[PDB]
Amino acid sequence: GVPTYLLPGSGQFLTTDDHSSAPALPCFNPTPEMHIPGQVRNMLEVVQVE
Amino acid sequence: GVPTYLLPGSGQFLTTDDHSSAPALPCFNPTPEMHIPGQVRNMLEVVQVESMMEINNTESAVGMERLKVDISALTDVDQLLFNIPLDIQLDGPLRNTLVGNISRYYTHWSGSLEMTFMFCGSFMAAGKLILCYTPPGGSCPTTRETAMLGTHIVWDFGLQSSVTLIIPWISGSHYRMSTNANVGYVTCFMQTNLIVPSESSDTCSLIGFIAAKDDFSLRLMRDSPDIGQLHAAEAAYQ
Amino acid sequence: GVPTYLLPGSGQFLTTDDHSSAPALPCFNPTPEMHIPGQVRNMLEVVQVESMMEINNTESAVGMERLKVDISALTDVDQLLFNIPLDIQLDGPLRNTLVGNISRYYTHWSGSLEMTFMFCGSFMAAGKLILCYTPPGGSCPTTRETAMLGTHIVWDFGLQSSVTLIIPWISGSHYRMSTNANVGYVTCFMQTNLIVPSESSDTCSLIGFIAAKDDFSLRLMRDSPDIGQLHAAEAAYQ
Amino acid sequence: AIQTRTVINQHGVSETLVENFLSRAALVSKRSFEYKDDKNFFKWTINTRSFVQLRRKLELFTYLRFDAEITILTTVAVNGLPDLTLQAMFVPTGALTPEKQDSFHWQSGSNASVFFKISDPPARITIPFMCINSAYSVFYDGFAGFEKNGLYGINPADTIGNLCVRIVNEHQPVGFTVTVRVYMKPKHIKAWAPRPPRTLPYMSIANANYKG
Amino acid sequence: AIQTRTVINQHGVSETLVENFLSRAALVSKRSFEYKDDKNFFKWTINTRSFVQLRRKLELFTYLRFDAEITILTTVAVNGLPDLTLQAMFVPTGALTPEKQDSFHWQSGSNASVFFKISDPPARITIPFMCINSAYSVFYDGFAGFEKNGLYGINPADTIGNLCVRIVNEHQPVGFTVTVRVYMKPKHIKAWAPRPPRTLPYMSIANANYKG
Amino acid sequence: LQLKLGNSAIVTQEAANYCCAYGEWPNYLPDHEAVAIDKPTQPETATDRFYTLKSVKWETGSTGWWWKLPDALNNIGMFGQNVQHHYLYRSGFLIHVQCNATKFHQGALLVVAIPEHQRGAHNTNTSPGFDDIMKGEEGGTFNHPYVLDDGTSLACATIFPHQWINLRTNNSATIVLPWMNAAPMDFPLRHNQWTLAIIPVVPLGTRTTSSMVPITVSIAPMCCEFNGLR
């Protein structure tokens, strides 16, 4: 097997973590993306409007 | 060693996970695969097979009576024979079909359907029917003249025993926040009388079929509501 | 570090797992391998060796008497000598053999077998036997004439002391939901009388052998039912 | 009731794959047994006909070839909670099933035993395709035997085996209740010859009798 | 009884490999011992002849060369459960076996000790091929010595060693029972000169006497 | 066109198109699947012929008919003699169903071949016995054809290999059945691979209250093997 050891911070839930999780429903294909007008990619695009 | 840390979701049993497990018996070679006829790889292959509709939309009709609509002298000019609400979910002609049963395993369905009506009178029985299609939103016709104003088929069954009609795109779903209800109708009216010779039977019957087409699709698998829950249950434990 | 999560089945001890473990003594060099004669790499190498059948199918025969069938003047014309039910599992001539014992470690077996009968009379003892093969399903013959109508060997043992016969494909299994039972028979009848000179013994004996062939196969290893369970047991603890 | 509708945007056939249609971990068995040292241990003949909704899904086919991914999810409740070792032993056809908690069949060198604790993740093993034939007969138009009610619909080559679960621990002064939930996920599924769905309620486990 | 039959579709020789025929984790020892601070600890001379079914499988051969994968599965029961450290110490031939729980032989710098808790997965080590010869003598047509009952069938080069298991913890106000199950899986197996199976029941562990 | 097979021949004038069940034509057991009983023997003709059953009377109150294969043939001719002497078999089937009606009769038949039609009984917990299943050449009658006597539906029975006989358009039906089993050989006296069901979806009719149509079933074993015996 693989010799492992747990670090400090193992088993914690940080609310800002960036980890993939288990898909609850894989084999579910979501509705495909459609072009909707006015896509926001940056909140500074909003702030530059008078 | 390897420095590791456990994630949120460690040690959980999700019932939809895709992880290999320990083989309980490796070095066991299973029985090899043999070619068996009729392999199913997709449940849409099942749904594209025609199956009989309960086009007799009358209650007190039970069993074999529900699969056929009788026409006779009791059917007049301009007379309504059957009305098929295009509902996979609800109780109607499409409920006990292969396209009704397999689609109740899924939440969202989508696609064209394929009706086929077969006249099963005698060889010399003649007459005309108006098979209508009413789209979703539209009102079902109540007269033969309103029927002819829509999308329709003037079907002479005197020589052509079978007629088929593409149903363009019904596509209902399931809602909890409530049904789809009215998504379309197939309606039949008597254009003429039934004309039979005096040695053929007075009464002649129609049967209907429904299949899905290749554009038909199903999504978000659920539990089918059809059979719910018996004998010799606790025999597999003693 | 490495983001990890534990699976269902973590921390279990499956008795059939295939995982390396910690060496208790590394830097210990074991004794090197020496060539020893007769290495077994496959248990089917054991099963393909002939071993004596208990062809004496009579009870009250014990020990050495069971391995031989006597023929004499007490054996008449058209007289049944032995009947070998082709059952590896059940009590019969094939139970205490190398093909019977090793196959009871497995659940499903399959393949051809190899019978050999050796006449062990005197040099001038003469006579004929009909060694029959009855396939599975078929009834065992009770007369010498029904015996000759099947697959058979008219064996003159006056000069040929050994005869061998391929058993085509018995292949039984184990069932719990019940046995295989009848899967075939090897049956022997007296075609002639035993003809011995007046200085040879009146009584002459046959012995039988069974081996498996190269198409023989075993599957789904289990515990053998043969020996169950004593003295000086708790000496390995004190 | 209120009636609604939505424009449905779908494309693709992948969710109606028979692998996707059938491979989910379904609850196939659930028993309680008390423990104070087939009573006092879990024994279950591994079938697919205990619950009617997995039964109706699999009876959409005539033949099925699959491996079974068995997950065993044991919870305890006293009559806190001690950490107990459980043995789950898959007893195939041709092996001998235990009848006691302390029987010698639990010492099986040849049966697949898994030893696991309550505090662990749930025990999970894959039972292979165990049949003598190429597929399991979901339906069987035949008899298991001919001698005086060898029953109809029973195939001798359909028996997976038994799933026997006990508590490896000995008797304790506390008494407690062990609930064993068994979850099966069929894997590597091939299916043949699809059938009409059952429209009437099941009456028995062993057959296809109908009340109407 | 009911009698059945199935068309059997088999091909291959891989399951009757002697590695596959013999490498399974078999229960080779099981003892209870009480604890209140060879009584009060587990000591087992590592043989293969404790249980008759592994004995009859290995006595299908004359010579065996294998590594032993020892798994130790300890359960506790009080007379909840505290988490206790156990020491399992493999004492080879030539080392000295403990006779007490608190003996100085448990402090062995040279014996392979494994320290493990109850809450852990079961302790697992691989004892190597320990023999002075190239194979273990399953049978030995000789004597261990010549001076006044140096016993028959005993080979001085067959001794694996002892598996000594104690509780590293000290005495507690609670009294409890420790059951030590030892599982052995032979590994990297070579076998030589196959033998007839035993047909009669065993009478003793130390010999091949038969009652008939 | 004649269906000529052996010393049997079905000599008709009209027969349009067969149904090939699951698209599979019956072939002999291939030389990689026969690891079993060595070289399963083939009479090649002696069984492979039409066995024309006793005709059934279709009337207005007919619920339908069924024959189980090979149980319908296990006591008929050289097929049924080989069933009693052999232990294993493998066969496909050619089934020809024919109606004798005039142009004044009406009615539709679903002629459906069901693989492993395990039957249920009605309003009981006991399984069907031996005499409720193994009817032989006479066959059985559907008690509840709407559920196919197994709790399912007749409406969805076109998922199986099937043919329609609508007496306007046709009076005959041909289904070609391959070998349908999870094993390559099987045991003909105690397991059935196919059930030929003939069910009137639209009942029979003419005016004079006693309308009656002959239905004739001709079953030919195709590629019929058996174990060696020598």
Side-chain angles (χ1 to χ4, degrees), chain B residues 41-90:
Chain B
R41 294 176 174 91
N42 194 2
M43 294 303 292
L44 292 173
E45 302 173 358
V46 173
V47 89
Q48 292 167 4
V49 178
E50 302 282 329
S51 64
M52 288 188 280
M53 300 183 284
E54 287 176 349
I55 61 168
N56 195 5
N57 51 1
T58 68
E59 295 295 325
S60 176
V62 292
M64 296 299 296
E65 296 293 328
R66 294 179 64 85
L67 294 172
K68 63 183 179 68
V69 165
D70 287 335
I71 71 172
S72 69
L74 293 176
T75 60
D76 294 331
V77 189
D78 299 331
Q79 192 266 332
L80 177 67
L81 289 179
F82 56 87
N83 194 358
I84 302 168
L86 291 179
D87 294 336
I88 287 178
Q89 289 89 9
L90 300 179

Side-chain angles (χ1 to χ4, degrees), chain D residues 38-162:
Chain D
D38 287 329
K39 62 178 74 174
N40 291 315
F41 67 99
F42 181 82
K43 183 261 174 184
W44 175 61
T45 299
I46 303 168
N47 57 353
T48 52
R49 297 167 68 181
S50 297
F51 295 95
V52 301
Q53 184 73 36
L54 184 68
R55 188 176 181 180
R56 187 178 178 271
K57 283 176 66 178
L58 298 178
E59 289 180 355
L60 294 175
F61 297 100
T62 307
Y63 299 115
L64 290 170
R65 185 188 175 96
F66 61 92
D67 297 326
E69 190 185 9
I70 302 296
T71 305
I72 296 164
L73 193 148
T74 296
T75 58
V76 289
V78 291
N79 287 318
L81 295 174
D83 196 4
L84 298 164
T85 301
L86 282 82
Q87 181 183 359
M89 186 173 66
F90 172 60
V91 180
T93 306
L96 296 173
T97 300
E99 292 88 7
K100 294 177 184 291
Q101 194 270 331
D102 53 351
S103 68
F104 65 98
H105 298 98
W106 293 106
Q107 299 182 359
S108 186
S110 65
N111 293 324
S113 298
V114 55
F115 289 90
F116 62 98
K117 289 185 261 74
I118 304 167
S119 66
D120 285 339
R124 182 183 282 169
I125 54 163
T126 302
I127 294 171
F129 174 72
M130 289 300 290
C131 179
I132 301 168
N133 301 321
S134 288
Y136 300 117
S137 296
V138 182
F139 290 91
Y140 187 71
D141 193 5
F143 292 87
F146 62 99
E147 289 176 352
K148 191 174 73 174
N149 284 316
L151 276 79
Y152 179 68
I154 306 301
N155 192 2
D158 273 333
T159 311
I160 313 294
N162 298 317

Side-chain angles (χ1 to χ4, degrees), chain C residues 98-132:
Chain C
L98 289 171
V99 74
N101 286 314
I102 301 300
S103 300
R104 284 191 296 275
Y105 288 100
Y106 292 89
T107 301
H108 312 291
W109 60 274
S110 165
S112 296
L113 293 185
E114 178 72 31
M115 278 188 181
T116 303
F117 294 99
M118 191 170 79
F119 179 70
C120 298
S122 65
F123 185 81
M124 297 178 70
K128 289 185 182 294
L129 301 175
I130 295 179
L131 282 171
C132 320

